Design a protein around this nucleic acid. Structure first.
Ligand SMILES: COc1ccc(C[C@H]2NC[C@H](O)[C@H]2OC(C)=O)cc1
Ligand SMILES: [Mg+2]
Ligand SMILES: [Mg+2]
Ligand SMILES: [Mg+2]
Ligand SMILES: [Mg+2]
Ligand SMILES: [Mg+2]
Ligand SMILES: [Mg+2]
Ligand SMILES: [Mg+2]
Ligand SMILES: [Mg+2]
Ligand SMILES: [Mg+2]
Ligand SMILES: [Mg+2]
Ligand SMILES: [Mg+2]
Ligand SMILES: [Mg+2]
Ligand SMILES: [Mg+2]
Ligand SMILES: [Mg+2]
Ligand SMILES: [Mg+2]
Ligand SMILES: [Mg+2]
Ligand SMILES: [Mg+2]
Ligand SMILES: [Mg+2]
Ligand SMILES: [Mg+2]
Ligand SMILES: [Mg+2]
Ligand SMILES: [Mg+2]
Ligand SMILES: [Mg+2]
Ligand SMILES: [Mg+2]
Ligand SMILES: [Mg+2]
Ligand SMILES: [Mg+2]
Ligand SMILES: [Mg+2]
Ligand SMILES: [Mg+2]
Ligand SMILES: [Mg+2]
Ligand SMILES: [Mg+2]
Ligand SMILES: [Mg+2]
Ligand SMILES: [Mg+2]
Ligand SMILES: [Mg+2]
Ligand SMILES: [Mg+2]
Ligand SMILES: [Mg+2]
Ligand SMILES: [Mg+2]
Ligand SMILES: [Mg+2]
Ligand SMILES: [Mg+2]
Ligand SMILES: [Mg+2]
Ligand SMILES: [Mg+2]
Ligand SMILES: [Mg+2]
Ligand SMILES: [Mg+2]
Ligand SMILES: [Mg+2]
Ligand SMILES: [Mg+2]
Ligand SMILES: [Mg+2]
Ligand SMILES: [Mg+2]
Ligand SMILES: [Mg+2]
Ligand SMILES: [Mg+2]
Ligand SMILES: [Mg+2]
Ligand SMILES: [Mg+2]
Ligand SMILES: [Mg+2]
Ligand SMILES: [Mg+2]
Ligand SMILES: [Mg+2]
Ligand SMILES: [Mg+2]
Ligand SMILES: [Mg+2]
Ligand SMILES: [Mg+2]
Ligand SMILES: [Mg+2]
Ligand SMILES: [Mg+2]
Ligand SMILES: [Mg+2]
Ligand SMILES: [Mg+2]
Ligand SMILES: [Mg+2]
Ligand SMILES: [Mg+2]
Ligand SMILES: [Mg+2]
Lengths: 48, 96, 136, 98, 177
RNA sequence: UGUACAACGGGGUAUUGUAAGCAGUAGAGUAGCCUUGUUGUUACGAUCUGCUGAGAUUAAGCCUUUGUUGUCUGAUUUGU
RNA sequence: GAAUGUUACCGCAAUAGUAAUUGAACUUAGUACGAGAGGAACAGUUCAUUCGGAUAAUUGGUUUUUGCGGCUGUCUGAUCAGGCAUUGCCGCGAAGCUACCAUCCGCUGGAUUAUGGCUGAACGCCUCUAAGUCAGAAUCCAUGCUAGAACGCGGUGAUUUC
RNA sequence: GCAGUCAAGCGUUCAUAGCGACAUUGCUUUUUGAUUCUUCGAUGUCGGCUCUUCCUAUCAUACCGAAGCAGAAUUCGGUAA
RNA sequence: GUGAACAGCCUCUAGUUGAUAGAAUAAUGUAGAUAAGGGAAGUCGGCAAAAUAGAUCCGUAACUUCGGGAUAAGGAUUGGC
RNA sequence: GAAACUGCGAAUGGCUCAUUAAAUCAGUUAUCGUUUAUUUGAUAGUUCCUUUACUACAUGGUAUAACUGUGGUAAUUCUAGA
């Protein structure tokens, strides 16, 4: 669907931004339930 | 309150004012993933379980969002919500 | 950055390639700094080395005391003008370019620093912190 | 997370967004966008640009009932008396007569 | 951040520490003078109304009514003004000041109870410290009793007992006017 | 022939920076007629102000729609 | 893109390609070693270089959105509203494109080389080697990643009567 | 131009840690000569820019053996393009 | 008409509206423009390009054949009513 | 009699010779051309209100230090709320 921005404190002992906020890009993907309609079974062969 | 957080709280969904440019609304569940991804808006996209147990510290860090941006993307968006916009602007020549 | 650098630095937009001239912001006698190199820079066919906030550069002094001209010295970039973006999300920029002349170890020739100073540079170079007024 | 405001226009600046200019003296001017930032560089006067806060604040635009009355006036009245003096002889001599 | 709360009816005072960025958040963007309902700040204070009257940021610089701004600035102050006591006649000093709009950077908020809530606050509503001093000017006595200039004021002057170990002495002001 | 599809229209979202019209004790000021001023009168005046964050534009690769109007069998080819 | 009944969908994997790179800081540690002067490394951490593949939430650039506003000259009697000036000029400018000028991401198993070893004869002694065998590198083969043989292949759907 | 063999000498002592005379065996075809076989009814000449690939006689980077290797630094050698 | 102007730009009279056309807007072009921060580091070489420009006022160096050099250089200013 | 308010003083003193060439400075003038805390001496019967059902003069108003108490800052002759 798209992108937006995020703010969060960062947790990383050792870094100059430990316990400081950061602002970060995120994408959003639309994800309604998938529906199951079949099963397929594979077997191993010397051809793969 | 999809787009709300513990710290934000203001009931609002992830859909930016005016709605995701070139897509629409997001009325289903979603996956928000840090950063950016191959493919473009509207394209089918497969998300896959990782092939190795990464340790990284970077992986492992349990994030907790403080605030999700939600202003329009169709310009230099100034307001998170019609509510905010109503607040700041005052009364207009339309309206009640 | 490199030697005498207390700490590390997150990457910030390179603003001053070789031949850039920046205001001299200490009381050392130097009026300007001509950048001839950037310490710890890398190599790409045709790429100019370029410095940013809190970088050690090799430099010469083109306007200033005669006792300070015709010779190469170390110096440290304190103001930038080319906008960079911090990890707190902000794009920010100064109204000019400026460093102060320093010795390999990062100690400063001059006693004071005139004008504001980027935080990412105070952080790096303690002797520079010392002499600052307004940081960032 | 502070929401900032536009030095020129008076507009809310949500995190990471617009640009930040640090002037010679050390006045930190914050813009929410290149529009403010250009007018600013052009030495434009916010009070003469009609869509700005300062313009409106100045030309008294749409404060409306912000200059109206209210309901804020206390309620108390209680006798402590005066320290050292027996506050148990500060009401049975406080009987008035007018 | 600490909260310096005063009940001016009883002339009491007690402080309160509140570590809840949510319970705090009610106070931000509010200026000095504005009132605040209580429930938001704690289940204790439900019903209470608080008037915001000042405070200090971490760094200790004070709030100053009517700056607006939620940041600091350096003003030029004079006689008869808050956050400055002149050392010399005609002296003005340029000093930093914290603005009157409350923000997370405040070390302490200064609050004054205006109207009481639904339940007593520990060392505040339950204890009552008295005035220190009483009327000294003739007519002020006549009004802290309501007297009509015929009643004679020498009698209503206040009397403060005091011990000299085994002598209990008694002192009154000196009526002026 | 239906959660259809389209063209409009409406609402959101944006961009600009306050439309046209009218009005005014705003305006450097200027003329014209006398009943020659105890705001004399009738107009003209760059610009300003109010109605008015107005007007305009906004998918052409923005979002959305209980409204309006329309559309919904032509062509060719394929076989173990 | 013809032909392998037609057409559709989901897959396999032969062969070919293949990718990551280097540095610093902290810490180890003023430690080991050293009369002293000097003075390391492994484990851990934070960043960076050079390369690569994407991506456009943010910021920057681009402007025929000729979208809104402003300006010169002229033309339409004035007004409104416009035309012309090889896109007249200027400020802002969404959308798209886009930049180490912006952001995100760049996998872990095995087998080996050199070399150091085990057991061990030749040669009653000795030997890493002759037989047999352990550990091992920015190597190699896999994993992973890109293509998919248009004459390599599998599973599945529906298959025309005037 | 690059690499060997002998080992007098160098290296405080000590031929070969690192080197190495007098001699002597080679390799290489970015040197320069020697030649004149191909092109004179025409194979566009220097250098740079751009860009790909290959060689290894390896400068860096990985793992090693050695030292006249205490540490630090360095030098010599192997597997390595 | 603007303007110093037979300039450029717009107009009246007259004269044209001729010059294959349609649909799209990939690469690479030809011609026209813009670009953050830096500022010749590019290159044989600032090639190309950019900058400057009218008028009024102020100000103007070396040197000189005293005629110049000179719009030297450097500055302010300019609409409408 | 601490603290504090109020008043007065801190414009004297002490120091130095940087600037300064008709400036300063000197001797001599002027104020019929001005301001002057102070010291000294003089100096004030009038204050109200259309001037009989009258105005606190036997004397009109609060708001502040010190203080009490709640506090902030690493830090100063910092100071906030009550
Ligand atoms: C000394 O530099 C040069 C000498 C000779 C040539 C030409 C020859 N090259 C090959 C043939 O013999 C002739 O080719 C042609 C095309 O004429 C070029 C450069
Ligand atoms: Mg946008
Ligand atoms: Mg200076
Ligand atoms: Mg080059
Ligand atoms: Mg010179
Ligand atoms: Mg110092
Ligand atoms: Mg711009
Ligand atoms: Mg832009
Ligand atoms: Mg008295
Ligand atoms: Mg239709
Ligand atoms: Mg308006
Ligand atoms: Mg297209
Ligand atoms: Mg409708
Ligand atoms: Mg076929
Ligand atoms: Mg140490
Ligand atoms: Mg020794
Ligand atoms: Mg853009
Ligand atoms: Mg226009
Ligand atoms: Mg009109
Ligand atoms: Mg025409
Ligand atoms: Mg023409
Ligand atoms: Mg990259
Ligand atoms: Mg794997
Ligand atoms: Mg294998
Ligand atoms: Mg053994
Ligand atoms: Mg072996
Ligand atoms: Mg073997
Ligand atoms: Mg053998
Ligand atoms: Mg590898
Ligand atoms: Mg991979
Ligand atoms: Mg195939
Ligand atoms: Mg098949
Ligand atoms: Mg010999
Ligand atoms: Mg030896
Ligand atoms: Mg010897
Ligand atoms: Mg050679
Ligand atoms: Mg021949
Ligand atoms: Mg020949
Ligand atoms: Mg020839
Ligand atoms: Mg030939
Ligand atoms: Mg050829
Ligand atoms: Mg080899
Ligand atoms: Mg030895
Ligand atoms: Mg080896
Ligand atoms: Mg290679
Ligand atoms: Mg190879
Ligand atoms: Mg090879
Ligand atoms: Mg003719
Ligand atoms: Mg032709
Ligand atoms: Mg054509
Ligand atoms: Mg540029
Ligand atoms: Mg320049
Ligand atoms: Mg050059
Ligand atoms: Mg130059
Ligand atoms: Mg060059
Ligand atoms: Mg040349
Ligand atoms: Mg040259
Ligand atoms: Mg040229
Ligand atoms: Mg330009
Ligand atoms: Mg000249
Ligand atoms: Mg004028
Ligand atoms: Mg004196
Ligand atoms: Mg008062």
């Amino acid at each position: 669907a798209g992108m937006t921005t995020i703010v969060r404190d960062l947790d990383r002992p050792g870094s100059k931004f430990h316990k400081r906020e950061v602002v970060e890009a995120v994408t959003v993907v639309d994800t309604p339930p998938v529906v199951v309609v079949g099963v397929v079974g594979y077997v191993e062969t010397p051809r793969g | 309150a999809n787009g709300a957080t513990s710290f934000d709280r203001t009931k609002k969904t992830i859909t930016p004012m005016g709605g995701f440019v070139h897509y629409g609304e997001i009325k289903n569940d979603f996956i928000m993933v840090k950063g950016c991804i191959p493919g473009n808006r509207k394209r089918i996209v497969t998300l896959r379980k990782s092939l190795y147990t990464n340790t990284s510290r970077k992986a492992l860090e349990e994030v907790s969002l403080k605030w999700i941006d939600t202003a329009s993307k169709f310009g230099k968006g100034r307001f998170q919500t019609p509510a905010e916009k109503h607040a700041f602007m005052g009364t207009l020549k339309k309206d009640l | 950055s490199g030697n005498g650098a207390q700490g590390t630095k997150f990457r910030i937009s390179l603003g001053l390639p070789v031949g850039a001239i920046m205001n001299c912001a200490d009381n050392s006698g130097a009026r300007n700094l001509y950048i001839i190199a950037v310490k710890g820079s890398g190599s790409r066919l045709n790429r100019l080395p370029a410095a940013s906030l809190g970088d050690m550069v090799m430099a010469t002094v083109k306007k200033g005391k005669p006792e300070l001209r015709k010779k190469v010295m170390p110096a440290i970039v304190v103001r930038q003008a080319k906008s960079w973006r911090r990890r707190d999300g902000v794009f920010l920029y100064f109204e000019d370019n400026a460093g102060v002349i320093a010795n390999p170890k990062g100690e400063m020739k001059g006693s004071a620093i005139t004008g504001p100073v980027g935080k990412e540079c105070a952080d790096l170079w303690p002797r520079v912190a010392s002499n600052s007024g307004v940081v960032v | 997370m502070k929401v900032e405001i536009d030095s020129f226009s008076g507009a809310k600046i949500y995190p990471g967004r617009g640009t930040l200019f640090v002037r010679g003296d050390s006045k930190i001017f914050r813009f929410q966008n290149s529009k403010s930032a250009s007018l600013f560089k052009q030495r434009k006067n916010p009070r003469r640009i009609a869509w700005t806060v300062l313009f409106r604040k100045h030309h008294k635009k749409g404060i409306t009932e912000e200059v109206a009355k209210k309901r804020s006036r206390k309620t108390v009245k209680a006798q402590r008396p005066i320290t050292g003096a027996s506050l148990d002889l500060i009401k049975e001599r406080r009987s008035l007569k007018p | 951040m600490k909260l310096n709360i005063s009940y001016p009816v009883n002339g009491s005072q007690k402080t309160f520490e509140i570590d809840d960025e949510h319970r705090i958040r009610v106070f931000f963007d509010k200026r000095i003078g504005q009132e605040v309902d209580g429930e938001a700040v704690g289940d204790e204070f439900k019903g209470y109304v608080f008037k915001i009257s000042g405070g200090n940021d971490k760094q200790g610089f004070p709030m100053k009514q009517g700056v607006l701004l939620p940041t600091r600035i350096k003003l030029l102050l004079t006689k008869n003004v808050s956050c400055y006591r002149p050392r010399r006649d005609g002296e003005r000093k340029r000093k930093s000041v914290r603005g009157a709009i409350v923000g997370p950077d405040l070390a302490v908020l200064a609050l004054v109870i205006v109207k009481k809530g639904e339940q007593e606050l520990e060392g505040l509503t339950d204890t009552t410290v008295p005035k220190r001093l009483g009327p000294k000017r003739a007519n002020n006595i006549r009004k802290f009793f309501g007297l009509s200039k015929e009643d004679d004021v020498r009698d209503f002057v206040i009397r403060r007992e005091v011990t000299k170990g085994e002598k209990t002495y008694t002192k009154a002001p000196k009526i002026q006017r």
